């Protein structure tokens, strides 16, 4: 077991850092500025069709919009590109982050989760203007999807098989179940992705032993520090969902 050194995924960008708000152009051109190889951000569909980047609440609300009272698949693009997060930064799509990568050089890896109302809907037309947008910004190698909810992912997988996916588990604090390493595989993920909280030095194990890589994820809840970071190693990740990327590359550094 040559020792892993795990590499950073940026939780909806710089993560819960100062230096801008989640889920921006501004976090995730600061990502690629300050070399950080992977990011994650939020899918969701907003009114008019296309793919938007947000969070937001545990049931899809915009707690800043009006009485905090909507979700995204009730605005148009134009509404949503007319609305404050940050001081200063907007509600970006999917397409203006590819934009974004396209001038850029720095080969940043994606993931994108789909969040998840009607990812698992039978077609909508989602996932093809997924995955068309994917191609039209030769981004196929450079993007893994994922999502708690695994037969989204399958409706993925059914247009382009190619498509790269991750399996989140521990979706409400549920234990990682018996066949989780069995489920990925059948799934055709080439990855699953666990909470910090229930994450075994067995589980990586299992996981490893059938060639898939994993992913430590830390809910927006939690503010990882060193401490943390000292067990990840331990364990043997091949990735880290962080709330701070830049606390964990200069940790890393030692």
Same mark, same amino acid.
């Given at each position: ?143 893994? +999807? ?7 992912? *399958? !409706?993925? @997988?059914? /247009?382009?098989?190619? &498509? ?33 909280? +229930? ?7 299992? *996981? !490893?032993? @059938?060639? /898939?890589?994993?992913? &430590? ?38």
């Amino acid at each position: 077991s040559k020792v892993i050194i795990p590499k950073i995924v940026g939780h909806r960008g710089v993560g819960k850092e100062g230096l801008a708000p989640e889920n921006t152009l501004r976090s995730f051109v600061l990502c690629m500025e300050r070399n950080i190889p992977y990011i994650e951000t939020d899918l969701r569909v907003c009114k008019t069709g296309e793919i938007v980047l947000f969070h937001g609440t545990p049931e899809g609300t915009i707690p800043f919009y009006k009485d905090g009272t909507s979700r995204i698949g009730d605005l148009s693009l134009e509404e949503l590109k007319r609305l404050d997060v940050g001081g200063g930064h907007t509600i970006p799509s999917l397409e203006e982050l590819f934009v974004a990568i396209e001038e850029q050089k720095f080969n940043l890896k994606l993931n994108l989760e789909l969040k998840g109302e009607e990812w698992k809907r039978k077609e909508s037309g989602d996932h093809q203007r997924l995955l068309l947008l994917v191609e039209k910004y030769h981004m196929q190698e450079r993007v893994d +999807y994922c999502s708690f909810h695994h037969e989204a992912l *399958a !409706h993925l @997988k059914a /247009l382009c098989p190619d &498509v790269k996916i991750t399996y989140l588990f521990n979706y409400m604090g549920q234990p990682t179940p018996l066949d989780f390493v069995e489920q990925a595989c059948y799934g055709d993920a080439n990855g699953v992705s666990m909470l910090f909280h +229930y994450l075994t030095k067995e589980q990586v194990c299992t *996981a !490893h032993e @059938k060639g /898939l890589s994993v992913t &430590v994820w830390m809910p927006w809840i939690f503010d990882d520090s060193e401490e943390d970071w000292k067990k990840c190693l331990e364990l043997q990740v091949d990735l880290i969902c962080s709330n701070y990327p830049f606390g964990l590359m200069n940790f890393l550094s030692n």
